[PDB]
């Protein structure tokens, strides 16, 4: 089943270790992080080095599809 949730997005960026933090927070969809910024992502317990890695892939997703 093709889905746009956060799980598939992390694989695309060669990442799959920060998914657990999203699960324990109640966030399981890319739509939940569409407007979140780098500073807002910090509250999610993710290190700062991962704020630019995950956030960067989210910007490109917007360019491909028009909201």
Q: Solved by what technique?
A: NMR
Report the length, in residues, of the chain. 67
| CATH code: domain of residue 48 | 1.10.150.50
19: containing domain: 1-67
Handedness of CA 36, 61, 67, 30 (dihedral sign): negative
- Within 13 Å, how many C-alpha atoms sit on residue 54's CB side? 30
Closest CA to 61 of 24, 35, 22: 35
Number of domains within the chain:
1
């Amino acid at each position: 089943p093709t889905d746009c949730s956060i799980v598939s997005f992390l694989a695309r960026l060669g990442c799959s270790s920060c998914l657990d933090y999203f699960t324990t927070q109640g966030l399981t969809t890319i739509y939940q992080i569409e407007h979140y910024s780098m500073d807002d992502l910090a509250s999610l317990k993710i290190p700062e080095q991962f704020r630019h890695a995950i956030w960067k892939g989210i910007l490109d997703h917007r360019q491909l599809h028009e909201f």
